[PDB]
CSV table of C-alpha atoms and ligand atoms in Angstrom, one decimal:
chain,number,residue,atom,x,y,z
A,1,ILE,CA,-7.9,-1.5,-14.2
A,2,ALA,CA,-11.1,0.0,-13.3
A,3,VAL,CA,-13.3,1.1,-10.4
A,4,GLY,CA,-15.8,-1.9,-10.1
A,5,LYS,CA,-13.6,-4.5,-11.5
A,6,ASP,CA,-11.3,-7.4,-9.7
A,7,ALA,CA,-8.2,-5.6,-8.1
A,8,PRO,CA,-5.2,-7.7,-9.9
A,9,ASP,CA,-3.7,-10.4,-8.1
A,10,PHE,CA,-0.1,-10.8,-6.5
A,11,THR,CA,2.0,-12.5,-4.5
A,12,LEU,CA,5.2,-10.6,-2.9
A,13,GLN,CA,7.3,-10.9,-0.2
A,14,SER,CA,7.2,-8.3,2.8
A,15,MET,CA,10.1,-6.5,4.2
A,16,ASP,CA,9.7,-9.3,7.3
A,17,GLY,CA,9.9,-11.9,5.1
A,18,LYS,CA,6.8,-13.3,4.4
A,19,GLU,CA,4.8,-14.5,1.5
A,20,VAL,CA,1.8,-12.0,1.2
A,21,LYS,CA,-1.2,-12.5,-1.7
A,22,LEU,CA,-4.0,-10.5,-2.3
A,23,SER,CA,-6.1,-13.3,-2.1
A,24,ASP,CA,-5.2,-13.8,1.2
A,25,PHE,CA,-7.2,-10.9,2.2
A,26,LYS,CA,-10.2,-12.7,0.7
A,27,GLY,CA,-13.7,-11.0,2.4
A,28,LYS,CA,-11.2,-8.4,4.0
A,29,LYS,CA,-11.6,-4.5,2.8
A,30,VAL,CA,-7.9,-3.3,1.7
A,31,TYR,CA,-5.9,0.1,1.9
A,32,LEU,CA,-3.3,-0.8,-0.7
A,33,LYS,CA,-0.8,2.1,-1.2
A,34,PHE,CA,1.9,2.4,-3.6
A,35,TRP,CA,4.6,4.2,-2.4
A,36,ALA,CA,8.3,5.3,-2.7
A,37,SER,CA,11.3,6.3,0.4
A,38,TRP,CA,12.0,9.2,-2.5
A,39,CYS,CA,9.0,10.6,-2.5
A,40,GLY,CA,8.1,13.4,-0.2
A,41,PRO,CA,4.5,12.9,0.5
A,42,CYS,CA,4.6,9.5,0.7
A,43,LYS,CA,7.4,9.8,3.7
A,44,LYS,CA,4.7,12.8,4.8
A,45,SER,CA,1.7,10.2,5.0
A,46,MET,CA,3.4,7.5,6.6
A,47,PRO,CA,2.7,8.6,10.3
A,48,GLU,CA,-0.8,9.0,9.6
A,49,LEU,CA,-1.2,5.7,8.1
A,50,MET,CA,0.6,4.3,11.1
A,51,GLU,CA,-2.7,6.0,13.1
A,52,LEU,CA,-4.8,4.2,10.9
A,53,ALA,CA,-3.1,1.0,11.6
A,54,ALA,CA,-3.6,1.4,15.5
A,55,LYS,CA,-7.5,1.8,15.4
A,56,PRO,CA,-9.3,-1.5,16.6
A,57,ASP,CA,-11.9,-3.1,15.2
A,58,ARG,CA,-11.2,-2.0,11.2
A,59,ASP,CA,-13.0,-4.3,8.8
A,60,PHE,CA,-10.2,-3.5,6.2
A,61,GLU,CA,-6.7,-4.7,6.4
A,62,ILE,CA,-3.6,-1.7,5.2
A,63,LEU,CA,-0.7,-3.1,2.6
A,64,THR,CA,1.8,-0.9,1.2
A,65,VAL,CA,4.2,-1.5,-1.8
A,66,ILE,CA,7.4,-0.4,-3.0
A,67,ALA,CA,9.6,-1.2,-5.5
A,68,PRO,CA,12.8,-1.7,-4.1
A,69,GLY,CA,16.0,-0.9,-6.3
A,70,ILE,CA,13.5,0.3,-9.1
A,71,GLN,CA,13.9,3.5,-10.7
A,72,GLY,CA,15.9,5.2,-7.0
A,73,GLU,CA,14.2,3.2,-4.8
A,74,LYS,CA,16.6,2.1,-1.6
A,75,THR,CA,17.9,-1.5,-2.3
A,76,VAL,CA,16.2,-4.4,0.0
A,77,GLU,CA,19.2,-4.5,2.3
A,78,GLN,CA,19.0,-0.4,2.5
A,79,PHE,CA,15.1,0.0,3.2
A,80,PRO,CA,14.5,-1.7,6.2
A,81,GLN,CA,17.1,0.4,7.9
A,82,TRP,CA,15.6,3.7,6.7
A,83,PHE,CA,12.2,2.6,7.5
A,84,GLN,CA,12.9,1.9,11.0
A,85,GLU,CA,14.9,5.4,11.6
A,86,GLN,CA,12.4,7.4,10.4
A,87,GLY,CA,10.0,5.8,13.5
A,88,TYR,CA,7.9,3.7,10.6
A,89,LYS,CA,6.6,0.4,12.0
A,90,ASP,CA,3.0,-1.6,12.0
A,91,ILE,CA,2.7,-0.8,8.4
A,92,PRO,CA,3.4,-4.1,5.7
A,93,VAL,CA,5.5,-3.4,3.0
A,94,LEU,CA,5.5,-5.4,0.2
A,95,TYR,CA,8.7,-5.8,-2.4
A,96,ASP,CA,7.8,-5.4,-6.0
A,97,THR,CA,11.0,-6.5,-7.0
A,98,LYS,CA,9.9,-7.4,-10.7
A,99,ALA,CA,7.7,-3.7,-11.0
A,100,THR,CA,5.0,-6.1,-12.1
A,101,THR,CA,2.5,-4.8,-9.7
A,102,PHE,CA,3.0,-1.4,-10.0
A,103,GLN,CA,2.6,-2.2,-13.5
A,104,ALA,CA,-0.7,-4.4,-13.0
A,105,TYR,CA,-2.3,-1.3,-11.0
A,106,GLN,CA,-1.1,1.5,-13.7
A,107,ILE,CA,0.7,3.5,-11.0
A,108,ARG,CA,1.7,6.9,-12.9
A,109,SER,CA,2.2,8.7,-9.8
A,110,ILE,CA,2.7,8.4,-6.2
A,111,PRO,CA,1.3,8.1,-3.5
A,112,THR,CA,-1.5,6.4,-4.9
A,113,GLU,CA,-4.3,4.1,-2.9
A,114,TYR,CA,-6.5,1.4,-4.0
A,115,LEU,CA,-9.3,1.0,-1.6
A,116,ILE,CA,-10.6,-2.4,-2.6
A,117,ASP,CA,-13.9,-4.0,-1.1
A,118,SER,CA,-14.4,-7.0,0.5
A,119,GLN,CA,-15.6,-8.9,-2.8
A,120,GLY,CA,-12.1,-7.8,-4.0
A,121,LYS,CA,-13.3,-5.0,-6.6
A,122,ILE,CA,-11.6,-1.7,-6.9
A,123,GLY,CA,-13.7,0.4,-4.8
A,124,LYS,CA,-11.7,4.0,-4.8
A,125,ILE,CA,-8.8,5.5,-6.1
A,126,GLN,CA,-6.9,8.2,-4.4
A,127,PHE,CA,-4.6,10.0,-6.2
A,128,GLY,CA,-2.1,11.5,-3.5
A,129,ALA,CA,-2.7,10.7,0.0
A,130,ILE,CA,-6.1,10.3,1.5
A,131,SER,CA,-6.9,11.4,5.1
A,132,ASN,CA,-8.1,8.5,7.7
A,133,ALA,CA,-11.4,10.1,8.0
A,134,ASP,CA,-12.1,10.1,4.0
A,135,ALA,CA,-10.3,6.4,3.8
A,136,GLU,CA,-12.8,5.2,6.6
A,137,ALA,CA,-16.0,6.9,5.2
A,138,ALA,CA,-14.9,5.2,1.6
A,139,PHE,CA,-14.7,2.1,3.3
A,140,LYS,CA,-18.2,2.5,4.8
A,141,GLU,CA,-20.1,2.7,1.3
A,142,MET,CA,-18.1,0.1,0.0
A,143,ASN,CA,-19.2,-4.0,-0.2
B,201,C6W,C1,13.4,11.0,-7.9
B,201,C6W,N1,13.8,9.9,-8.7
B,201,C6W,C2,14.5,10.1,-9.8
B,201,C6W,C3,14.3,8.6,-8.4
B,201,C6W,C4,12.9,9.5,-8.8
B,201,C6W,C5,11.8,9.7,-10.1
B,201,C6W,O1,12.7,9.3,-11.0
B,201,C6W,P1,11.9,9.0,-12.3
B,201,C6W,O2,13.1,8.8,-13.6
B,201,C6W,O3,12.1,10.7,-12.9
B,201,C6W,O4,10.3,8.6,-12.7
B,201,C6W,C6,9.9,7.2,-13.3
B,201,C6W,C7,9.6,6.6,-11.6
B,201,C6W,C8,8.1,6.2,-11.6
B,201,C6W,C9,8.2,4.5,-11.2
B,201,C6W,C10,8.0,4.5,-9.7
B,201,C6W,C11,8.1,3.1,-9.5
B,201,C6W,C12,8.3,1.9,-10.5
B,201,C6W,C13,8.4,2.3,-11.6
B,201,C6W,C14,8.4,3.8,-12.2
């Protein structure tokens, strides 16, 4: 994994039971956030991400990834209940049930965001939360 190189492919079930592939988003920039329900700064960054999702006419898609049941994350049954109770919605959550997407993207800390360009290359990486302003600006400087 490296800035400027292809973002690793993945095929994951969403919280809502749909299969989602990075390749589904060819030609769209992607905001890809790895997080966990047990992580304070991850929770704290979610309402701001809902703000971003609510903005019309974005040339990027938002996708987030958790590893359900892994290293303390909530079970697949418990997670959606918790998510809804926080008031969270309109944010895709993909289930990395094998931890292989976290592994593929070499996650060391959370939250981590990969901002992937329209050509499927990693454009930016941010350790910790990124402001919506900074994310929007970043996507403007990417292909
Ligand atoms: C606070 N509790 C102990 C759950 C969270 C920290 O757990 P920990 O054992 O101290 O750190 C490893 C988690 C890193 C990770 C993330 C996602 C998938 C695979 C590995």
